[PDB]
Amino acid sequence: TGELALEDRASLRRVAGLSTELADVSEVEYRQLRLERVVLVGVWTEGSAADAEASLAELAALAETAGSEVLEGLIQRRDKPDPSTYIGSGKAAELREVVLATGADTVICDGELSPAQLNALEKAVKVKVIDRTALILDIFAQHATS
RNA sequence: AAUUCCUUGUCGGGUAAGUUCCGACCUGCACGAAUGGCGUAACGACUUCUCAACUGUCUCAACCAUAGACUCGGCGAAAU
């Protein structure tokens, strides 16, 4: 009753991190510039906020090296990520309008999700959901020569 | 709660290699139903599995008798 997610302020968290990056001019190449703007999301259960920020920084570096460009650092906490959605219940509708201030329909989740989670969180925001392992595989696919 | 989708390998028993299975651990909207879900002795030419004994089922076949097949006489078809 009045809890929605049945938790503390971990229920709803628009942390926004530290604004991982906010891209600008001097990288405008062709109509197809680096417009793959990505919003990161994660969950912080076992550890400290400093190491969670470090993990988000690592994910941001990975997404930046793999083309694309990060512009958000949300951290929403839940002891056990909803094995139905990765970030939460009301966050499903919340992200839909959160991504409207940004406008690139790409969300990257810091962790290995399962197909139910992928499709649920996708349909909840109408954007493309990308795993950390998927991003690493993309980096290898791009750098592989032999 | 007496809830098994619980192949979320969540380990062992069973054998040389193991299926049906039995047990603690992972299993939160999941849950199914408010009168439909759980237990149940006895019973069943119902479905699945493990043993003791037994065997030509098999490794791998061999011999004997009878009814046809085959030879002689008689009557004498059929689908196409």
Side-chain angles (χ1 to χ4, degrees), chain A residues 56-84:
Chain A
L56 266 291
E58 210 188 49
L59 180 76
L62 264 54
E64 293 179 353
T65 180
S68 310
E69 174 45 61
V70 67
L71 61 83
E72 195 158 354
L74 310 179
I75 298 96
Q76 151 56 26
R77 195 271 179 181
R78 182 177 182 82
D79 62 358
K80 195 73 148 281
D82 353 60
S84 67

Side-chain angles (χ1 to χ4, degrees), chain A residues 88-137:
Chain A
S89 48
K91 276 62 62 177
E94 185 178 2
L95 261 173
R96 172 62 221 161
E97 53 251 28
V98 172
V99 303
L100 293 179
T102 61
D105 74 89
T106 300
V107 64
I108 297 162
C109 302
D110 188 358
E112 192 206 41
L113 300 149
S114 79
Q117 313 194 30
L118 281 83
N119 61 50
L121 192 173
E122 191 196 279
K123 186 183 314 170
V125 185
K126 318 305 190 178
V127 305
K128 144 161 81 174
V129 302
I130 296 298
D131 295 332
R132 184 174 178 271
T133 66
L135 189 66
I136 289 163
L137 292 181

Side-chain angles (χ1 to χ4, degrees), chain A residues 7-35 37-67:
Chain A
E7 294 183 353
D8 305 326
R9 63 174 70 86
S11 289
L12 270 287
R13 293 190 66 196
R14 283 187 270 171
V15 185
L18 283 74
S19 181
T20 57
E21 162 66 12
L22 203 68
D24 70 314
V25 304
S26 301
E27 62 187 16
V28 297
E29 166 49 26
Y30 184 51
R31 191 86 273 172
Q32 189 181 7
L33 59 90
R34 308 176 91 262
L35 60 92
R37 314 261 160 152
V38 300
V39 164
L40 315 184
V41 66
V43 176
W44 169 59
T45 65
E46 282 84 7
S48 303
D51 63 70
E53 185 181 0
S55 177
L56 266 291
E58 210 188 49
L59 180 76
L62 264 54
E64 293 179 353
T65 180

